Design a protein around this ligand. Structure first.
Ligand SMILES: OC[C@@H]1O[C@@H](OC[C@@H]2NC[C@H](O)[C@H]2O)[C@H](O)[C@H]1O
Ligand SMILES: [Ca+2]
Length: 361
């Protein structure tokens, strides 16, 4: 149990010539053999077309090396935004258990279109193959009236793989809404199913992440753009809300809850949720958001009155992400790739591993 924590390891410091914000949107993955993989949006000068770098750690995140790049082999655009890594926990069609997936959005350098893709690695991240196209959208700017798709998140439920994402395609009715599609083979995707939408046109629920709880329930966490009560001097904000459901295909008609910590802190922006068995029968739900450095925890299965907040040494970052370690539930990785543009040339990809038993004190 000794020597497993470490603070602010620098995974990747981009060159001066990368385009603002240079890097962003870090995502980690623990494989069944204990190795870690990571990726981020890599804003290299183009051409050549942008790619998702894949880094590997064998020592629990202390040291890293690049072992491959996921490249767009289909569109001659690049893999540009919102990567997401995922290890299959069971076979889906011809992809066995242990296959690594990388989802993300392929987008031309002019940002005229958006395309959520799935790539797969059969060798724990050394090589990649295109698998399928998921969702095509329009222009890659987060403005009302445009029709892009964004921000894929993968999770298995029973025999289905669910891919949740953000959707502006219903542009006459919702500025953006949250949706999913499912697959049983990674080839054929189900029709679009709504997960969260709001009647007010200018509402923009976005950036969905999901975690399984030990009471047969799932928690769906998102940033509710256009949510009520923007703070003084703000006409529009992105408070973190969530929903609870037994069936993670049916969040749509579940009551929303805002996350507010015991002291009144209101996380906002680009959230990320995990659950670990640490801390009791209920374990611990841990959420990060994009505007605070603290983590927010809940040891009461998502009871709205039970959120707490704790400092960690990893700085605030856009869609700062979290990872739990299968063989040690007390250990939490927090990974970030800096802030939204303008970043001032100072974003780097970094991570910390903390113990909840130390940090929750
Ligand atoms: O990831 C790069 C980033 O994506 C764009 O924003 C997407 C919006 N984020 C919250 C909403 O869910 C979505 O519409 C932004 O232009 C890029 O910097
Ligand atoms: Ca740099």
């Amino acid at each position: 149990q000794k020597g497993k924590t470490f603070s602010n390891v620098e995974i990747f410091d981009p060159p001066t010539n990368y385009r603002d914000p240079q890097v962003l949107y870090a995502r980690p993955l623990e494989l069944s053999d204990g190795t870690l993989l990571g990726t981020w949006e890599n804003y290299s000068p183009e051409p050549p077309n942008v790619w998702f770098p894949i880094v590997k750690s064998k020592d629990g995140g202390k040291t890293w090396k690049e072992i491959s790049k996921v490249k767009d082999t289909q569109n001659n655009w690049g893999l540009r935004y919102q990567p997401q890594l995922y290890e299959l926990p069971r076979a889906f069609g011809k992809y066995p258990k242990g296959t690594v997936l990388c989802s993300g959005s392929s987008i031309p350098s002019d940002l005229s279109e958006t395309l959520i893709e799935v790539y797969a690695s059969r060798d724990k991240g050394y090589t990649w193959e295109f698998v399928s196209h998921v969702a095509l959208g329009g222009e890659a700017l987060p403005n009302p009236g445009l029709t892009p798709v964004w921000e894929p998140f993968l999770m298995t439920y029973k025999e289905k793989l669910i891919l949740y994402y953000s959707d502006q395609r219903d542009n006459a009715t919702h500025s953006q809404k949250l949706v999913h599609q499912t697959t049983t083979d990674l080839k054929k995707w189900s029709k679009v199913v709504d997960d969260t939408k709001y009647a007010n046109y200018y509402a923009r629920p976005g950036m969905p992440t999901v975690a399984k709880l030990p009471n047969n329930e799932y928690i769906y966490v998102y940033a509710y753009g256009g949510g009520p009560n923007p703070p003084a001097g703000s006409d529009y904000w992105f408070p973190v809300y969530y929903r609870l459901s037994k069936d993670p295909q049916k969040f749509l008609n579940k009551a929303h809850h805002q996350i507010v910590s015991n002291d009144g802190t209101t996380p906002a922006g680009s959230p990320y949720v995990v659950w670990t068995p640490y801390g009791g029968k209920n374990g611990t739900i841990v959420v990060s958001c994009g505007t605070r450095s603290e983590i927010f925890t809940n040891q009461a299965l998502g009871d709205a009155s039970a959120w707490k907040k704790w400092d960690v040494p990893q700085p605030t970052a856009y869609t700062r992400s979290l990872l739990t370690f299968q063989k040690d539930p007390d250990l939490l990785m927090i990974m970030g790739a800096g802030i939204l543009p303008p970043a001032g040339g100072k974003n780097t990809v970094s991570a910390s591993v903390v113990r909840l038993s130390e940090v929750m004190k």
